[PDB]
């Protein structure tokens, strides 16, 4: 364990105060047995003081999230492109901590809200902590950091009543998107399956901004970070995400925790697109613009190394709640660009940590400490944990022999700003006209989705915009959507009873780009960790025998099996009362249980509804045992449908079923606009 030095064991021993005096903490000290509590009860006050002070402010954004420890391993010595030490040798390993999150919701909001997601990675390198504070979507809503509070105020709950929680489905958000057209690209992403990923493990990570890789000789290249999931791309469907948000608000954090505990820690290839400084404006947009992607057709990915998360935190508050990332945590070999969104972020993280931590020594929390020595003249501050020996903490000095020494390009492996960087011109609060095309790339993204996928995106927009009360805002939203796609505007307008404006073809085109579609990304590369719900009954010993056999066959392949029946007993994990289709990636009914398809033990129709929901939401579903018509007919599920299975043979059933799990979603169950 990377933080073992800081762990406190309470598996033995007597209760003590924080200063080691043995005490009790179960009854207050009173003046008589039915008397008033005494002020001199220090046991009471120290315990309740601590409780009263347990909370710290949630993150201003990305308040809802979860983290894990792991390791990064480099695939090569990358000297040829960067001086970065963590990348300087094949097989070199660096500990990491990653936190994943939504953006809008507070603490305690649902994991399966539709939102942008954070993906923040710390590399505890041998030349300092390096943080990549990224998202699951490669482009951001706005083109200047100064706009962030406008965006976030608009998305977060209306400030008179604090409604609605963790949702863009309200007037203010769509007022802002329609007034600030830069938002279109990220908006289209958020309205796709990327807004409701199946898990943190099934999403990619992006730095969003263009950064620089800087060699020890001072030359630089432009880069984009892209962490490519080894688990596949996968989304929920919206109706499923809504039910999930109520049945399991902790869905993503539980999925990550469980995958790690089972030895299925998630992996990504840490990649970059690498281009020349001369290509800043060569691709038909400006690399300083965080609303644009570099299509892969123009710049392929270079795999730098492997990221694997394989260790859960010991204490969530101390590790996951207190981790404080900064894009300012940069190392020699990396530099910034003049992306005005990035530029302003550099200020915000350092300042906001004062808010959360309540004082300036937040880098001393165990989770934030580096894994190398610290030499500097930073002193004092509330919560100062060091005892500095150097009594002359100023530069230049002779009384400490000139130490610490200055580090720079030529000495001490100092960070240095890419020396080819320049600035010219007027000091201006002006937007570059190179940033002005807000619509072509949203259209590129949309064009690249499959037909059903395009339908899901249209449907997400229909859902949210139909909840906007202002007819003017709705009109304004159609005006912007229509600049990306007339057809999107027409289909969305249909649901809200307004007319779409006439086509405006300025930014329309037919181009597509690879690697942005979820539905088109093919079957999952692994089905380990995927969840199978076996619906059985205690009414028939035969049904539980079937479920035990099925369990064995499925578990051999690393699937997580839940057997559901009316009541618990050995071999049954979950009652119908607590079971839901959102708990599973595939659902199997054992034919011994066909009769179930009213009781005081579960809501009326529960067993059938689990099956029907799983089918409606695109999941593989099946009946095992040979007798299937009763169940399939009660569920209105066609026996010969794609992703519908019926076999007597457990082996055969499982072989076919596992293909369905990799396919993951049977999209021919969803209606399309004609």
CB hemisphere CA count around 216 (13 angstroms): 12
Residue closer to Ca ion, measured from CB, 181 or 197: 197
Q: Which does 235 bind (CB under 5 to 8 A by kind): ligand HEM, a copy of itself, Ca ion, none?
A: Ca ion
Number of residues that bind ligand HEM (CB under 6 A): 31
Q: Point out which span in 56-64, 520-528, 567-575, 639-647 binds a copy of itself (CB under 8 A).
A: 56-64
With beta carbons less than 8 A apart as the criterion, state whether 3 and 367 touch.
yes
CB hemisphere CA count around 305 (13 angstroms): 21
Q: Does 476 bind a copy of itself (CB under 8 A)?
A: no
Residue closer to ligand HEM, measured from CB, 145 or 223: 145
Cβ 280 to a copy of itself shortest distance, Å: 8
Residue in the shown chain whose Cβ atom is closest to ligand HEM = 118
Q: Is the dihedral of CA 595, 597, 599, 601 positive or negative?
A: positive
Q: Point out which span in 40-48, 453-461, 616-624, 632-640 binds a copy of itself (CB under 8 A).
A: 40-48
- Give, rounded to a whole angstrom, the gap between the first and last alpha carbons of the chain: 57
Cβ 129 to a copy of itself shortest distance, Å: 4
| 365's tokens | 């929390």
Could you say which of 70, 118, 205, 265 contacts ligand HEM (CB under 6 A)? 118
Residue closer to a copy of itself, measured from CB, 34 or 469: 34
With beta carbons less than 8 A apart as the criterion, state whether 535 and 587 touch.
yes
Q: Does 37 bind Ca ion (CB under 5 A)?
A: no
Q: How far apart are CA 373 and CA 9, in angstroms?
A: 27
Q: Is the dihedral of CA 198, 200, 203, 209 positive or negative?
A: positive
Could you say which of 94, 235, 441, 609 contacts Ca ion (CB under 5 A)? 235
Q: Does 413 bind Ca ion (CB under 5 A)?
A: yes
Write out the H or E segment, with its range, that includes residue 260: helix 251-261
Write out the H or E segment, with its range, that includes residue 624: strand 621-624
φ, ψ at 411 (rounded to 5°) = -145, 140
Q: Point out which span in 154-162, 318-326, 484-492, 652-660 binds ligand HEM (CB under 6 A).
A: 318-326
CB-CB neighbours of 577 under 10 Å: 14
Contact flags string 487-526 toward Ca ion, x per CB under 5 A: -------------------------------x--------
φ, ψ at 222 (rounded to 5°) = -90, 135
Could you say which of 140, 213, 445, 597 contacts ligand HEM (CB under 6 A)? 140
| 166's tokens | 């963790």
Q: How far apart are CA 275 and CA 282, in angstroms?
A: 10
Residues facing 74 on adjacent strands: 305
Q: Point out which span in 127-135, 435-443, 502-510, 560-568 binds ligand HEM (CB under 6 A).
A: 127-135
644-647: strand order across its sheet: 574-575, 560-565, 531-535, 586-590, 621-624, 644-647
Contact flags string 61-80 toward ligand HEM, x per CB under 6 A: xx--x---------------
Q: Which does 404 bind (CB under 5 to 8 A by kind): ligand HEM, a copy of itself, Ca ion, none?
A: a copy of itself
Residue closer to ligand HEM, measured from CB, 208 or 644: 208
Q: Point out which span in 302-310, 347-355, 503-511, 576-584 binds ligand HEM (CB under 6 A).
A: 347-355
Q: Does 303 bind a copy of itself (CB under 8 A)?
A: no
Q: Per-residue DSSP letters for 650-670?
A: HHHHHHHHHHHHHH---GGGS
Q: What residues line the site for ligand HEM (CB under 6 A)?
A: 48, 52, 59-62, 65, 99, 101, 118, 120, 133-135, 140, 145, 148, 208-209, 290, 323-325, 341, 344-345, 348-349, 352-353, 356
């Amino acid at each position: 364990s990377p933080l073992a030095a800081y762990e406190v064991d309470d598996s033995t021993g007597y209760l003590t105060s924080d200063v080691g005096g043995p005490i009790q903490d179960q009854t207050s000290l009173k003046a008589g047995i039915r008397g008033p509590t005494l002020l001199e009860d220090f046991m009471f006050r120290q315990k309740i003081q601590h409780f009263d002070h347990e909370r710290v402010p949630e993150r201003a954004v990305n308040a809802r999230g979860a983290g894990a420890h792991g390791t990064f391993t480099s695939y090569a010595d990358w000297s040829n492109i960067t001086a970065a030490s963590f990348l300087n040798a094949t097989g070199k390993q660096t500990p990491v901590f990653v936190r994943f999150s939504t953006v809008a919701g507070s603490r305690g909001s649902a994991d399966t809200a539709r939102d942008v997601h954070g993906f923040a990675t710390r590399f505890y390198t041998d030349e300092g902590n390096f943080d990549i504070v990224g998202n699951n979507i490669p482009v951001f809503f706005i083109q200047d950091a100064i706009q962030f509070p406008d965006l976030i105020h608009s998305v977060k709950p209306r400030p008179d009543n604090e409604i609605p929680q963790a949702a863009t489905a309200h007037d203010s958000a769509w007022d802002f998107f329609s007034q600030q057209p830069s938002t279109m690209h990220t908006l289209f992403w958020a309205m796709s399956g990327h807004g409701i990923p199946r898990s943190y493990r099934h999403m990619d990570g992006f730095g969003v901004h263009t950064f620089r890789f800087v060699k020890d000789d001072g030359s630089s290249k432009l880069i984009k970070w892209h962490f490519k999931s080894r688990q596949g791309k996968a989304s929920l469907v919206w109706e499923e995400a809504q039910v999930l948000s109520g049945k399991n608000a902790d869905f993503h954090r539980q999925d990550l925790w469980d995958a790690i505990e089972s030895g299925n820690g998630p992996e990504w290839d840490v990649c970059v697109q690498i281009v020349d400084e001369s290509q800043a404006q060569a691709f038909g947009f400006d690399l300083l613009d965080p609303t644009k992607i570099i299509p892969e057709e123009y710049a392929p990915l270079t795999k730098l190394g492997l990221l694997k998360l394989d260790r859960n935190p010991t204490n969530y508050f101390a590790e996951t709640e207190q981790v404080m990332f900064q894009p300012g945590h940069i190392v020699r070999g990396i530099d910034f660009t003049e992306d005005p969104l990035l530029q302003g972020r550099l200020f915000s993280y350092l300042d906001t940590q004062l808010n959360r931590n309540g004082g300036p020594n937040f880098e001393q929390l165990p989770i934030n400490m580096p894994r190398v020595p610290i030499h500097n003249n930073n002193r004092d501050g509330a919560g100062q944990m060091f005892i500095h020996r150097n009594k002359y903490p100023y530069t230049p000095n002779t009384l400490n022999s000139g130490y610490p020494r200055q580090a720079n390009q030529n000495a001490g492996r100092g960070f240095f700003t890419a020396p080819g960087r320049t600035a010219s011109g007027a000091l201006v609060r002006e937007v570059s006209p190179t940033f002005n095309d807000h619509w072509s790339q949203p259209r590129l993204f949309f064009n690249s989705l499959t037909p059903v996928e395009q339908q899901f995106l249209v449907n997400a927009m229909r859902f949210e915009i139909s909840l906007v009360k202002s007819e003017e805002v709705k009109k304004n939203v159609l005006t912007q959507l229509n600049r990306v796609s007339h057809d999107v505007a027409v289909r969305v307008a249909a649901a809200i009873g307004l007319g779409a404006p006439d086509a405006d073809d300025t930014y329309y085109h037919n181009n597509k780009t690879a690697g942005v579609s979820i539905v088109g990304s093919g079957p999952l590369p692994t089905i380990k960790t995927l969840r199978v719900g076996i619906l059985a009954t205690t009414s028939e010993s035969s049904a539980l025998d079937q479920a035990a056999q099925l369990r064995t066959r499925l578990e051999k392949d690393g699937l997580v099996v839940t057997v559901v029946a009316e009541t618990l007993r050995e071999g049954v994990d979950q009652t119908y009362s607590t079971a839901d289709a959102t708990g599973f990636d595939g659902v199997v009914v054992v034919d011994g249980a066909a009769a179930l398809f009213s009781s005081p033990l579960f809501p009326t129709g529960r067993p059938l509804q689990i099956f029907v929901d799983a089918y409606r939401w695109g999941k593989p579903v099946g009946v095992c045992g040979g007798k299937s018509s009763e169940v399939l007919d009660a569920a209105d599920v066609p026996e010969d449908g794609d992703g519908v299975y019926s076999e007597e043979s457990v082996d055969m059933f499982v072989e076919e079923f596992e293909k369905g799990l990799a396919t993951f979603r049977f999209t021919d169950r969803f209606a399309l606009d004609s």
